[PDB]
């Protein structure tokens, strides 16, 4: 649009002692006058301006970059054999990297931190573009890192909110894809053991799944529907696995510290995703491909190791907030996964919860919370 | 005493012999009981029971007197007054001020009163039988408590079906035991042990009676319920006897001491295994109470079995959607007792 032009006017005006910057800006403004151009000619002064680390070069640049990514201006590398050379230089991973690189720890200016959270949000969660792979997971991790590392309470909060919206969206998109999948299956029919053992029980191989490039979808053949479904589901699995892993750290006797805040946001996000999208987890149509043999595997069976690991490490915590969030996760597992998790449920009941009830010096509130979970299970299915 | 004998040939022969030797008095009394009428049988039983309450019949002579008493019961067609008198005379025989009978003699009396309770048609008779039965077994265990009390002073993978084949203590051909009477460590050991074999035999008998596989007022269910009730009463009222590490019973094979709890383990677990998951709420609730006692006092000794019961019976129940809500809530209440203990 023209926000591109206002951005370049501000950048060229505020360039100051940086001649190269002014020159790239003006070169871009000139190139626009033929009404747009080569993505790189517009992207060069934006990128450079983000590297000054001052206001308003950096904030204006970040704003422009996020909006340009959301308008599908930038694209990802392709492996189509029908490309003729005329295609633009793919720049989306680089645009997202440029945004992410502006956060360099707690000394980064608070206005810039905020602008980074908003630009990643605009890049990742918009109405025209779906980003998959490394770019998405980088945006998500960067918003988390700002939540964890900023010394601004305000920024910690907007980051928490934005992170929640992002992980929520990744799973909502998967839920939509499964809904479509089941509609297609229906249409198709119409026409006619200890606690210590659980840390070493990983049936699903997920080596190098975090790897792989950024892809982009805009908003016909079953092979293609299956591959898209795989993209969506893989985003989901990587997000979920990430939070289980963050939840598994062991702490000694802390609530405003980074370790405890990390454990809490991880457990909270795991619980929220389970509660709001339990059908994504339990559907026998939800399938992700193993890395070793490329054989399709049930989603629940694939995340099982990480879920049980999160509970193994955090159940029986002496911190009541952590104990409570595990109780709720365990409730979901007890209610919607009795069959798939039968043995694990048995271990958690014997070695963590009943063990706690039998313990004489154990906090009474915790005991009552657990027993309350049992009563809730009696009065539901 | 003489009045009883005054109230055909043997009778007067006894009176003549008084001018006394036990057999001459025991002969007409025994014969009189076989009449099956009032007031012959009632008076004879009355007298025999009183004599056993005394030490006239003694340390086998007590067993024959008790046999004669027990033989007066031939089922529900037996006259009600005779039933009641039998219950009272057996009470007087087991619970008196001077004499404690051990072994078969004890075990014969207790089984008989139980049977009267099971077979009588008199609500009154079955109830008084129940009360006396409870008092008998309670008294046996109380006696053991006293003996242990003296003794410390003087000293100073695994499943529900495997539990049916896990018997570490062998009591094959342990038998009822010989009849003995109570009013130098070896004599003391013989005595402490005397009490302990009595207790073990009672408890085993009741677990066994509880072990049958199957309305609510019929004989099988009333048998099951009274066995479970008594088992629970013994655990609840005399737990220290079960938990005491000095309370020891000698194996039948090699006479090597074994802890009492470890000895009754098989039978207690069998009782829970067979009755734990019953669809009938009374049985379910009583088993729950027993399981509670096992949970509170035998966590160390019974860890694996408790784990088996939790996984295969109670949690299983909690997981079933079509399961009765009342049972689930009874179990969860047990767990909550575990919270606020």
Numbering used by the authors:
A (entry chain A): 4 to 38, 42 to 198, 245 to 271, 293 to 326, 331 to 458
B (entry chain D): 7 to 13, 25 to 36, 43 to 82, 96 to 192, 244 to 270, 294 to 324, 331 to 457
What do the authors of the reporting publication say about this deposited model?
At the TGN, the Arf1-5 GTPases are activated by the BIG1/2 proteins in humans and the Arf1/2 GTPases are activated by Sec7 in the model organism Saccharomyces cerevisiae. The TGN-localized Arf-GEFs comprise roughly 1800 functional residues including a central catalytic domain of ~200 residues mediating nucleotide exchange. Conserved domains C-terminal to the GEF domain, termed HDS1-4 (homology downstream of Sec7), act to integrate the signals from several small GTPases, including Arf1 itself, to switch Sec7 from a strongly autoinhibited to a strongly autoactivated form. The N-terminal DCB (dimerization and cyclophilin binding) and HUS (homology upstream of Sec7) domains, though conserved in all Golgi Arf-GEFs and essential for Golgi function, remain more of an enigma.
Here, we present the crystal structure of the regulatory DCB and HUS domains from Thielavia terrestris Sec7 and demonstrate that they form a single continuous structural domain. Following correction of the annotated intron, a construct comprising residues 1–458 of T. terrestris produced crystals diffracting to 2.6 Å. Using experimental phase determination by single-wavelength anomalous diffraction of selenomethionine-substituted protein, the structure of the DCB and HUS domains was determined with four copies in the asymmetric unit. The best resolved chains in the model lack only unresolved loops and the final ~35 conserved residues of the HUS domain absent from the crystallized construct. The DCB and HUS domains together form a single continuous armadillo repeat joined by a conserved ~1400 Å2 hydrophobic interface, comprising helices 7 and 8 from the DCB domain and helices 10 and 11 from the HUS domain. We therefore regard the N-terminal regulatory region of Sec7 as a single DCB/HUS structural domain. In the T. terrestris DCB/HUS domain structure, residues 245–271 of this interdomain region (between helices 8 and 10, including helix 9) are resolved in their packing against the armadillo repeat, and the remaining 46 and 21 residue stretches are unresolved in the structure. The crystallized construct forms a dimer in the crystal via its C-terminal helices 14 and 15, with helix 15 of each copy aligned antiparallel to each other. Dimerization is known to occur in N-terminal constructs of Sec7 and its homologs, and small-angle X-ray scattering (SAXS) analysis confirmed that the observed dimerization mode occurred in solution as well as in the crystal. As such, it appears unlikely that the intact DCB/HUS construct (1–492) is prone to the same artifactual dimerization issues at its C-terminus as is the truncated Sec7(1–458) construct.
